[PDB]
Amino acid sequence: EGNDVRRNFDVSKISGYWYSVLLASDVREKTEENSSMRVFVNHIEVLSNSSLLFNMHIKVDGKCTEIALVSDKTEKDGEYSVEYDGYNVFRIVETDYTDYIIFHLVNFKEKDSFQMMELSAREPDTSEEVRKRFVEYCQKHGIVKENIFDLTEVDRCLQARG
């Protein structure tokens, strides 16, 4: 429905202030409180070369910490690469630049692999159908509904923003 694009992107119109609605993975533990992969998007900015800078927050013993990651563009179009708790390869799944965005990420830790998907939005929360549309996408990626954690119903470091 609406005006969602999943093919060729206009990265220029995706640079701005995003939130973090839902975060899901293949493992139950990597979506938990102290799990490194529980980060909260604040801002994204287009670089000189089209690489992406992510201003975001993580809870270090209950205290919100500022983190910045530059994800370098790779061979395949629409996908970026960044190293954090191992090697990460992620790609923009689909987005309605004015409402939501879906991200898929594989973290190539040495000898083990985990995939993760995040739903971010221009506003702290987005539509129940968009909430559903994410579950349909991460269902195809084999991530079961049981392991789709909600960020809307927890402290997402809102304050420190920024």
Strands (E) across the chain are located at: 16-17, 22-25, 40-46, 52-60, 63-73, 79-83, 87-96, 100-109, 112-121, 148-150
Q: How is residue 128 annotated by DSSP?
A: H
Strand partners, 83: 87
CB neighbours of residue 103 within 10 Å: 19
∠ CA 135-28-74, rounded to 5°: 65
CATH of the domain at 20: 2.40.128.20
| Resolution in Å, one decimal place | 2.8
CB 34 within 8 A of CB 126: no
First to last CA, the chain: 33
- Edge-first strand listing for the sheet containing 52-60: 16-17, 40-46, 52-60, 63-73, 79-83, 87-96, 100-109, 112-121, 22-25, 148-150
What is the number of structural domains in the chain?
Answer: 1
